[PDB]
Write an enzyme that holds these catalytic residues in place. Sequence first.
Site, PDB file in Angstrom:
ATOM      1  N   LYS A   1      23.232  22.562 -52.115  1.00 30.10           N
ATOM      2  CA  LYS A   1      24.657  22.315 -51.938  1.00 30.10           C
ATOM      3  C   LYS A   1      25.150  21.538 -53.153  1.00 30.10           C
ATOM      4  CE  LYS A   1      25.960  19.359 -48.843  1.00 30.10           C
ATOM      5  NZ  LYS A   1      26.396  18.664 -47.602  1.00 30.10           N
TER       6      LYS A   1
ATOM      7  N   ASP B   1      32.470  14.141 -36.690  1.00 32.66           N
ATOM      8  CA  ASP B   1      33.101  15.380 -36.249  1.00 32.66           C
ATOM      9  C   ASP B   1      32.067  16.491 -36.125  1.00 32.66           C
ATOM     10  OD1 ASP B   1      36.102  15.483 -35.831  1.00 32.66           O
ATOM     11  OD2 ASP B   1      36.036  14.356 -37.720  1.00 32.66           O
TER      12      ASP B   1
HETATM   13  C1  LIG Z   1      26.314  22.428 -43.550  1.00 35.84           C
HETATM   14  O1  LIG Z   1      25.848  21.889 -44.782  1.00 35.84           O
HETATM   15  C2  LIG Z   1      24.790  22.507 -45.388  1.00 35.84           C
HETATM   16  C3  LIG Z   1      24.437  23.826 -45.171  1.00 35.84           C
HETATM   17  C4  LIG Z   1      23.372  24.381 -45.876  1.00 35.84           C
HETATM   18  N1  LIG Z   1      22.990  25.727 -45.672  1.00 35.84           N
HETATM   19  C5  LIG Z   1      21.683  26.188 -45.468  1.00 35.84           C
HETATM   20  C6  LIG Z   1      20.609  25.331 -45.365  1.00 35.84           C
HETATM   21  C7  LIG Z   1      19.338  25.848 -45.171  1.00 35.84           C
HETATM   22  N2  LIG Z   1      19.051  27.134 -45.068  1.00 35.84           N
HETATM   23  C8  LIG Z   1      20.094  28.017 -45.162  1.00 35.84           C
HETATM   24  C9  LIG Z   1      19.810  29.398 -45.049  1.00 35.84           C
HETATM   25  C10 LIG Z   1      20.823  30.334 -45.138  1.00 35.84           C
HETATM   26  C11 LIG Z   1      20.513  31.737 -45.028  1.00 35.84           C
HETATM   27  N3  LIG Z   1      20.256  32.847 -44.918  1.00 35.84           N
HETATM   28  C12 LIG Z   1      22.142  29.917 -45.345  1.00 35.84           C
HETATM   29  C13 LIG Z   1      22.442  28.588 -45.455  1.00 35.84           C
HETATM   30  C14 LIG Z   1      21.431  27.595 -45.366  1.00 35.84           C
HETATM   31  C15 LIG Z   1      22.658  23.612 -46.790  1.00 35.84           C
HETATM   32  C16 LIG Z   1      22.997  22.289 -46.989  1.00 35.84           C
HETATM   33  O2  LIG Z   1      22.310  21.441 -47.812  1.00 35.84           O
HETATM   34  C17 LIG Z   1      21.418  22.021 -48.758  1.00 35.84           C
HETATM   35  C18 LIG Z   1      24.071  21.728 -46.297  1.00 35.84           C
HETATM   36  O3  LIG Z   1      24.430  20.415 -46.520  1.00 35.84           O
HETATM   37  C19 LIG Z   1      23.647  19.451 -45.826  1.00 35.84           C
END
Ligand SMILES: COc1cc(Nc2ccnc3cc(C#N)ccc23)cc(OC)c1OC
Length: 378
Positions: A95, A223
Amino acid sequence: ANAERIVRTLCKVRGAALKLGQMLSINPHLAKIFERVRQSADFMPLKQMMKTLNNDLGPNWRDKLEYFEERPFAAASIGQVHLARMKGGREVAMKIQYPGVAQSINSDVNNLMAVLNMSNMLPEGLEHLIDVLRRELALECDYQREAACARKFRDLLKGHPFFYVPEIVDELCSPHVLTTELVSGFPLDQAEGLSQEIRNEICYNILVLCLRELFEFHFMQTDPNWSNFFYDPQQHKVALLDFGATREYDRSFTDLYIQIIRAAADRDRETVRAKSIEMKFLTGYEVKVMEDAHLDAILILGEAFASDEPFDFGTQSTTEKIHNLIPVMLRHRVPPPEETYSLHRKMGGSFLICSKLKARFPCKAMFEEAYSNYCKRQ
Ligand SMILES: COc1cc(Nc2ccnc3cc(C#N)ccc23)cc(OC)c1OC
């Protein structure tokens, strides 16, 4: 026209608009505008993303990965998530937030309010709306704090049979970048089409977790957002990635809130009022209708936790009452202390997830267990 016009402007400040939407829980047809903004794919150019990376993870950051997906998987509140794979083959999710998002908060918040005020669609709520908004956005930007919160919650859930927090990859973390292990499954955003049986157990465990976050951990997300709960159908588990607005509270403060829920389930309106004043939910001299609007909005909570029979969160009636669990701002000007605002927002946001997923299950058992542990600590 003015609709798409507003939407286009609010996308330039997507993070602030969405965070404002959470504070009011989706009124005019502005709810559509917010939804359209929620679906908008206004991502920051890759050049900008590569800037924050090279300027945080170092000029040789790509040397650490076998693969970096250039197309973002989805937009975060302020950043965007790119999937990648580390040199060892470990799949991760990165992220990356944009440069200067923290310095653009005041400017973006003002632009948001200017758009809304000019559009004459806002409910026109109180000053206090800006202060809380700039505060919550600043918290989301501190990814280092977010990382620490994630490691703490992972420990709290050690050995849990249903929930787990993906591990943090410190090698790929920074103030503007937060990296976790890849998780299998999809966000509960896309779980409406699941079986009524799966959705009932997901939400049952979420509400039990909500009670623990409030009255056992004292370490909760302000939230709740069902887009940040990933359900793994293969393992029948939920991965928790909603720890961007996490805060702690004194056990004495959360103990006042559990007394309110206790009284609410006992249909003791006076104790709900008295303890509500003690928590500064109310000042004690709100007009009869404002006080009754707050006490009424709480009845839904007491109804569920008092019913040994299944409680249907997805009914038209219960759904509407769950969406009105934010009477804390309407015609309501020391404001409701941000600590009180967040506690009732955690409970209500949890009921909201149960309602949007049309869940139905008993709630008395889980609260009596939570209240029992409280009495033990006492
Ligand atoms: C809500 O926030 C966050 C969401 C994510 N999204 C994901 C994380 C781990 N696996 C995933 C796999 C797929 C597939 N196909 C899609 C998204 C993924 C990552 C974050 O941090 C790195 C976030 O912030 C803390």
